[PDB]
Design a protein around this nucleic acid. Structure first.
Length: 48
DNA sequence: TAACCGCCAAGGGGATTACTCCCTAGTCTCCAGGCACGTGTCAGATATATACATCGATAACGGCCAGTTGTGTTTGGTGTGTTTG
């Protein structure tokens, strides 16, 4: 899932590729059609 | 008493003869034997060749070591300013 080179993996993004959650058809669909913002996790701001 | 000598006798058979048969020494030819080669075969010796074995060298294979987003504070120095000596 590290969208970058192996040597500098930590410098690249994380979670870009995830394991498809095959727990129930609805979950599969939701997963295949999901988004994710690059903003840092748990940011103090609340506009985004 | 019979070996020997003497007179007597018949005729056997040894030597010779004319003549005849066919024998055998001899010749050219050509077989049987025998000792020499000729081709062939088996056995052996010398030689070339393939194969397995010991030993030596390279070097493939094993394995090690080497380098290859944000908030809230502090401190510490520079420039300006005022007063002092």
């Amino acid at each position: 899932g590290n969208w970058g080179d192996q040597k500098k993996a930590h410098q690249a993004r994380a979670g870009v590729s995830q394991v498809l959650n095959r727990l129930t058809f609805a979950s599969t669909l939701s997963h295949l059609r999901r988004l994710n913002s690059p903003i840092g996790r748990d940011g103090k701001l609340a506009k985004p």
